[PDB]
Design an enzyme around this catalytic site. Structure first.
Site, mmCIF file in Angstrom:
data_model
loop_
_atom_site.group_PDB
_atom_site.id
_atom_site.type_symbol
_atom_site.label_atom_id
_atom_site.label_comp_id
_atom_site.label_asym_id
_atom_site.label_seq_id
_atom_site.Cartn_x
_atom_site.Cartn_y
_atom_site.Cartn_z
ATOM 1 N N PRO A 12 -5.585 -15.642 -1.918
ATOM 2 C CG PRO A 12 -5.225 -17.305 -3.502
ATOM 3 C CD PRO A 12 -6.176 -16.175 -3.175
ATOM 4 N N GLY A 14 0.247 -12.710 -2.319
ATOM 5 C CA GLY A 14 1.019 -12.412 -3.490
ATOM 6 C C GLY A 14 0.289 -12.005 -4.739
ATOM 7 C CD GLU A 38 0.137 -8.450 5.755
ATOM 8 O OE1 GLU A 38 1.064 -7.633 5.612
ATOM 9 O OE2 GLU A 38 -0.079 -9.392 4.969
ATOM 10 N NE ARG A 168 1.553 -8.730 -7.731
ATOM 11 C CZ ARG A 168 1.745 -8.150 -6.560
ATOM 12 N NH1 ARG A 168 2.226 -8.825 -5.522
ATOM 13 N NH2 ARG A 168 1.456 -6.862 -6.396
#
Lengths: 311, 306
Positions: A12, A14, A38, A168
């Site tokens: 996931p 974050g 990324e 976060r």
């Protein structure tokens, strides 16, 4: 006869994946470790315009009842197919250079990636299916297109309490989507373990009604990704899955069974995550390369990607 | 280990692909067009959705961006049956047998490239798909296994229009612009295979698009000289160049055969049978591959054939 170590940091969004990866790469020599980041040049500009903004906008739209389910699915499906392109092409050009597994000497090269193709062809779609913005048929179409799993596919997934995770992210903050993606990655780890412990989804399909990827006992099929495909849309009049969808689960089984999954605890400082990831890499599987000049070849492919779609 | 002959009948719709193959014992199984998947199983009336969307775009009822999203998503549905079939069959395919009989002949109504390359490219040419989406599908084309024999068609446009008109599928709209685009794509595809087989290097010839094989301008590579894929200085982004490298690799090892469709159905069928002598056969990997492959083909037909 040089070896290669490929490590895909996934899970996931974050959790601190990108930071941890950059910190790990920063400890190594510039010529023995390369980060495939990324693809931001690709997603906000090159493949289409703002693709992340469109996804979160459509889910909010759908959630507020402003659009139909069909409308959102078309948008989600097309966005996903677009979003996964860089991972898929990277895998396809790297494929010819990968030989068999060697063992857990230091690799001549270590390639660390920001995500694996299954994030865009399996996990995100599955999460969108849970959010009601993607059909199960479309998810299975993506699964059928997952590229054959190259030897030495080491995938690192993340662990992190929901409260700390939510904290976060608080700096569209979709908590339902956050929960769905955490569940999907939890299912993914269990699915690999299930398959590696000899699980046969066809044998256990009947047990359906209503994580540790490389440790522990065999999970129940109900705690694996297979459970998500019990949807009425995929069932024939006799009650069983149509064969088309059954074959896609066969592909899912095949692609995931040969992966090497590890769990990294992100509930710690950035240097802590880094040193933990560095410990985990020791037990990861390396592969031989097919030619002598593959190291340099692969290395420039990685740099090029890095230079163009993320920096 | 026994031998297998895989034959993919492909090319533009409306030439008689389906009529011809139906006409052509137990040592030959037919994997038909997955019409039930398209009309009901994967989604509701996918062909109708595709043709309605193009029509809406042509009439100015929807924008290019709206149509592309609808179009790209629908292509996923159309190709799923071919992609899942290829993926389950892959492990059973061994190496070439070379230049007697095949133990089993598998005839398919289309190859995965129809849905992951040709149709998407034709829609790009119709302004209802972005070139980036097309290359996204291209990046997912499955590795080309040995013995990939693809039959493409030959047929004058006028006769093709006639044939297309009397074999419209559920929800299809008679679109001559789409017919032209799909015919163009498949002609470029045949040329592209020859270009690659004769040593053509798209990277080496790329400059010729802006000035013994076909010119790169007569191949599928010309379609990718689309402004959306280029940087401000005119260079193709590396991501897209990588997709073209994949395209070249997938297409180069296919064995293309041309079937003249400008004849009776019986004639088309006879010509198709004659083309099998030059097709490449492969060995299977396990002793139970034949029966398993057989089951697969029969099951697909029963469930998804109309």
């Amino acid at each position: 006869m040089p070896t290669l170590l490929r490590v895909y940091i996934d899970g996931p969004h974050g959790m601190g994946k990108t930071t941890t990866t950059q910190l790990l790469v920063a400890l190594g020599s510039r010529d023995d470790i390369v980060y495939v980041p990324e693809p931001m040049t690709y997603w906000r500009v090159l493949g289409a315009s703002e693709t992340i903004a469109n996804i979160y906008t459509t889910q909010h739209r759908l959630d507020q009842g402003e659009i139909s389910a069909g409308d959102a699915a078309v948008v989600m499906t097309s966005a996903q197919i677009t979003m996964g392109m860089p991972y898929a092409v990277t895998d396809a050009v790297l494929a010819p250079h990968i030989g068999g597994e060697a063992g857990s000497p230091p690799p001549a090269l270590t390639l660390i990636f920001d995500r694996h193709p299954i994030a865009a062809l399996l996990c995100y779609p599955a999460a969108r299916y849970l959010m009601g913005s993607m059909t199960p048929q479309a998810v299975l179409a993506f699964v059928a297109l997952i590229p054959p799993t190259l030897p030495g596919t080491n995938i690192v997934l993340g662990a992190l309490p929901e409260d700390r995770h939510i904290d976060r992210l608080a700096k569209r903050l979709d908590l339902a989507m956050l929960a769905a993606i955490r569940r999907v990655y939890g299912l993914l780890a269990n699915t690999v373990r299930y398959l590696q412990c000899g699980g046969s989804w066809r044998e256990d399909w009947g047990q359906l009604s209503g994580p540790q990827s490389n440790a522990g006992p065999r999970p129940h099929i109900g705690d694996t990704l297979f459970t998500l495909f019990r949807a009425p849309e995929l069932l024939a009049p006799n009650g069983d899955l149509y064969n088309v969808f059954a074959w896609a689960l066969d592909v899912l089984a095949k692609r995931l069974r040969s992966m090497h999954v590890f769990i990294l605890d992100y509930d710690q400082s950035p240097a802590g995550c880094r040193d933990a990831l560095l410990q985990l890499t020791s037990g990861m599987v390396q592969t031989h390369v097919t030619t002598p000049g593959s190291i340099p070849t692969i290395c420039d492919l990685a740099r090029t990607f890095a230079r163009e779609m993320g920096e």
